[PDB]
């Protein structure tokens, strides 16, 4: 069983090394792609969506000075 565990560890490094290398490439490509996609207007649109998502609004000149929930 000790020998089998040694073989398991030998096979474990390669699997984790492959994932690290694969993850690095995806992040690297995902980085040079954002150099174009993240213009100020795109960031503004994403800001609109994120701020307005799942939000309640109490707008009006004479907002009351009370609240309970």
């Amino acid at each position: 069983e000790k020998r089998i565990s040694e073989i398991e560890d030998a096979a474990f490094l390669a699997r984790e090394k492959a994932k690290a290398d694969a993850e690095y490439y995806a992040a690297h490509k995902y980085a040079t792609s954002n150099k174009h996609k993240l213009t100020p207007e795109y960031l503004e649109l994403k800001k609109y969506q994120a701020i307005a998502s799942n939000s309640k609004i109490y707008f009006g000149s004479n907002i009351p000075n009370m609240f309970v929930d």
Binding site: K47, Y48, I51, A52, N54, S55, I57, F59, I63
Partner: peptide, 16 residues
Amino acid sequence: NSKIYFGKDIPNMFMD
């Protein structure tokens, strides 16, 4: 995250 807003008008929501 759940949010609530208070302000004079809608456009002020996105201003920072």
